[PDB]
Structure 1
Amino acid sequence: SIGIAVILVGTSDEVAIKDAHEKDDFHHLSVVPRVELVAMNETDPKSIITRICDLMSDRKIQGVVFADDTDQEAIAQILDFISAQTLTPILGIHGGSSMIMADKDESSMFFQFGPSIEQQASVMLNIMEEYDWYIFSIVTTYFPGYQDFVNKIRSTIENSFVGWELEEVLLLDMSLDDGDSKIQNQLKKLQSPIILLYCTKEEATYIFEVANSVGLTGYGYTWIVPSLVAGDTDTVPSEFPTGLISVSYDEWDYGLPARVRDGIAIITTAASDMLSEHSFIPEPKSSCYNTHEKRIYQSNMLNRYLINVTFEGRNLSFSEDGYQMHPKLVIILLNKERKWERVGKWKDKSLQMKYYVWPRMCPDDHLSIVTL
């Protein structure tokens, strides 16, 4: 009996109680996919701590799968700390937990469910190299993750055989709102169509109203943002210029029960590939991490076998820092109706989208020429 638990908190997913029985197709590995399910209303730290280690103390939970919402990544930190303290592979999968922590802990076994930063940067570069040919600028505050975002696209810029003329990157000290007007003069000095930026939501509002003050919001431009600027909503604020493009996770069609099944399969396939090949013991814990963490500390960790697991015809391996190689991404844009229209899919560095011509929304040029 492999202890797999599913926790759905503050959610509306009662019908998923039937979704667990869809895991009866787990005969391919033929190792016990023993599974139960729990639930809960509104959540705090204390509730989570108590509830989960009560469960693991009750019925020998080998692993657990989380799912919640309301976007308070504090739970994403809490679950990681728990994982570290108990040496137990948990797998948080939904909007609440699925917010990538940059630097997790060492003794953790967390393995979140979503895309990194560099992957978003590479998708941006693919989109750009399709039509608009130059990374004409990068304007970013120094919110964390800063130095890596620039480094990734720069490393891809240099290491290519096509044009890629980057004009200038320039940060801004948003913490003191005086010199931003001069740096925004210099932002007008970004005489360049395709600009890129990376900051928080309120910073995006501020920068967009400033670019309105210097008129860079016009149609002689185009903007791109990662899956952090306002993507976590269907309510766009003001100041957001239309035509704006982003790249977010596919939270619009990817089935929550499909997610649950995927995670269940993940843990089961891992347990099989560990035991059947070694006949080892993924020994359960006596209690939640009260005193006896030492007896389990001696056991070698199956994380190596949890890293690389396929199933269903999909490569679902992670990286060492807990994010998906080969995730499922989509591209979205802000049309005139101020609603996030879904445009393109992405898999294996491929792109499929709206027809080969770009929409090029309205605020008289760009004739269309025919030949043979």
Structure 2
Amino acid sequence: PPSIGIAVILVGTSDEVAIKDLSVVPRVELVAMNETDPKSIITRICDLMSDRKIQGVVFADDTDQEAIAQILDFISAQTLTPILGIHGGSSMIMADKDESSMFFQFGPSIEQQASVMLNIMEEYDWYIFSIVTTYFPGYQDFVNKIRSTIENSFVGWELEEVLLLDMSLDDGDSKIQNQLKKLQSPIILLYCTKEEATYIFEVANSVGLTGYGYTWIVPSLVAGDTDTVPAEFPTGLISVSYDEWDYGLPARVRDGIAIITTAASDMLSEHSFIPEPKSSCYNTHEKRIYQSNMLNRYLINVTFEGRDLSFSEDGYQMHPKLVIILLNKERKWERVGKWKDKSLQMKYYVWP
């Protein structure tokens, strides 16, 4: 069989040895990346394209840097090269991906997480709540998901307030503080970034909203690296997390390599061709009439070792086994439940 070049970029500390364990065959190359700024990531991927001729990229990082998703979507659409954000900032929820994107993420979507949050609430009969978002992309999709779900549930849900915080400006005037004082609900769903959440929480504490009788449910990106716990995060904070526990990095890399290889084998064994790995980022403008995102139809619905690795219409994993986590007294994230297939299985009946 012919060979396909797959680059596995690993930002941060990783066990390359543990990680090292069809119509076409992969020729994998593990790449260690030091920096995560736009120039470094763009430059790294572009140099890898220039030498090896890469059919697709598998990307993993250890950061709380959700912009890596945007950088990678940008690189993906411009070069028309498949990129898989398998872990960290690369797998975090994003803005609307490009029309020409080939970026697929292992993490759960905005709407998936929003449902998981309501499933937690239905379980402990937490029907009275408020939503607090920043302008982080998808904030409207988050509110709209809750609202649509809520308005068809023959349950007595009561969405008391929806706050929109502008984080792009300095808060010297104490606008955020005055908005947060509007909150009266025992449950608050917070949609924002980990960086934004640290500020918001510092404020919410001043207004006495982080204490007992106040529960904050947050999405995956606010928890991020569970080993980096901002001091301003309230003890008793509930979050959703993509199973860093059981779906370890080597399994993810293997699955990432499987997706690109299967997709390529399928397109080849159907169209008698695969897309040519373009050897430049500096010619994209010239050769776009010759390129397309054709591989996406094959990348979106790969099945390997019976495991259904299919992706959503928006590029997030279709069926992810999420993990519900609680920030305990020893300021450490604890597993308190699991979300496998439309069903929630919690640890506690009553929270201690």
Same fold at TM > 0.5: yes
CA–CA distance in 1 between the matches of 2:207 and 2:68? 40
Structure 1 residue 243: Cα displacement: 1.8
Distance 1:257 1:128, change over 3 A: same
Structure 1 residue 157: Cα displacement: 0.4
CA–CA distance in 1 between the matches of 2:79 and 2:230? 42
Secondary structure of the corresponding residue to residue 136 of structure 1? strand
- The CA deviation string for residues 131-174 of structure 1, in whole angstroms up to 9 with x for no partner, is 12314222334444332221110010001222222223344566
Structure 1 residue 316: Cα displacement: 1.8
Secondary structure of the corresponding residue to residue 253 of structure 2? helix
8 A contact 1:7–1:38 mirrored in 2: yes
CA–CA distance in 2 between the matches of 1:175 and 1:40? 30
Distance 1:114 1:293, change over 3 A: farther
8 A contact 2:323–2:339 mirrored in 1: yes
Instruction: Report what 1:89 is aligned to.
Output: 82
Structure 1 residue 226: Cα displacement: 1.7
Distance 1:49 1:185, change over 3 A: closer
8 A contact 2:36–2:68 mirrored in 1: no
Tell me which moved more, 149-158 or 40-49: 40-49
Distance 1:311 1:135, change over 3 A: farther
- The CA deviation string for residues 161-204 of structure 1, in whole angstroms up to 9 with x for no partner, is 22222223344566788998798688666544223233344554
Distance 1:95 1:140, change over 3 A: closer
Aligned length: 348
Secondary structure of the corresponding residue to residue 46 of structure 2? helix
8 A contact 1:86–1:293 mirrored in 2: no
Structure 1 residue 341: Cα displacement: 0.9
8 A contact 1:87–1:297 mirrored in 2: no
Distance 1:182 1:134, change over 3 A: farther
Distance 1:184 1:284, change over 3 A: closer
Distance 1:129 1:59, change over 3 A: same
Instruction: Report what 2:38 is aligned to.
Output: 45
- The CA deviation string for residues 233-269 of structure 1, in whole angstroms up to 9 with x for no partner, is 4343344432221112222342111111001111111
CA–CA distance in 2 between the matches of 1:105 and 1:82? 10
Tell me which moved more, 163-172 or 341-350: 163-172
CA–CA distance in 2 between the matches of 1:87 and 1:149? 29
Tell me which moved more, 227-236 or 90-99: 227-236
CA–CA distance in 2 between the matches of 1:327 and 1:231? 16
> Scaled by the length of structure 2, what TM-score is found?
0.83
RMSD value over aligned CA atoms?
Answer: 3.3
CA–CA distance in 2 between the matches of 1:175 and 1:47? 25
Tell me which moved more, 5-14 or 202-211: 202-211
Between structure 1 and structure 2, the one with the greater Rg is: 1
Distance 1:101 1:189, change over 3 A: closer
Distance 1:301 1:139, change over 3 A: closer
Structure 1 residue 103: Cα displacement: 1.9
8 A contact 1:136–1:195 mirrored in 2: yes
Taking only the aligned residue pairs, the percentage that are identical comes to: 99
Instruction: Report what 1:2 is aligned to.
Output: 4
Instruction: Report what 1:344 is aligned to.
Output: 337
Distance 1:202 1:45, change over 3 A: closer
CA–CA distance in 2 between the matches of 1:226 and 1:106? 26
Instruction: Report what 1:228 is aligned to.
Output: 221
Secondary structure of the corresponding residue to residue 169 of structure 2? coil
Distance 1:313 1:180, change over 3 A: farther
User: Gaps (5+ residues) in structure 1?
Assistant: 20-29, 359-372
- The CA deviation string for residues 280-331 of structure 1, in whole angstroms up to 9 with x for no partner, is 3433435555379527725671211211122233322212332111123111
Distance 1:336 1:122, change over 3 A: same
CA–CA distance in 1 between the matches of 2:327 and 2:173? 26
- The CA deviation string for residues 66-96 of structure 1, in whole angstroms up to 9 with x for no partner, is 2233344554433333322322222232214
Distance 1:69 1:236, change over 3 A: closer
Tell me which moved more, 152-161 or 318-327: 318-327
- The CA deviation string for residues 105-127 of structure 1, in whole angstroms up to 9 with x for no partner, is 22221112212211111000001
CA–CA distance in 2 between the matches of 1:82 and 1:221? 42
- The CA deviation string for residues 183-232 of structure 1, in whole angstroms up to 9 with x for no partner, is 86886665442232333445544544544444444422322112233443
Q: Which protein has the bigger strand share?
A: 2
Distance 1:276 1:105, change over 3 A: same
8 A contact 1:286–1:292 mirrored in 2: no
Structure 1 residue 44: Cα displacement: 5.7
8 A contact 1:91–1:112 mirrored in 2: yes
8 A contact 1:91–1:263 mirrored in 2: yes
Tell me which moved more, 289-298 or 129-138: 289-298
Distance 1:60 1:349, change over 3 A: same
8 A contact 1:283–1:296 mirrored in 2: no
CA–CA distance in 1 between the matches of 2:278 and 2:86? 23
Secondary structure of the corresponding residue to residue 305 of structure 1? helix
CA–CA distance in 2 between the matches of 1:279 and 1:87? 19
8 A contact 2:194–2:224 mirrored in 1: no
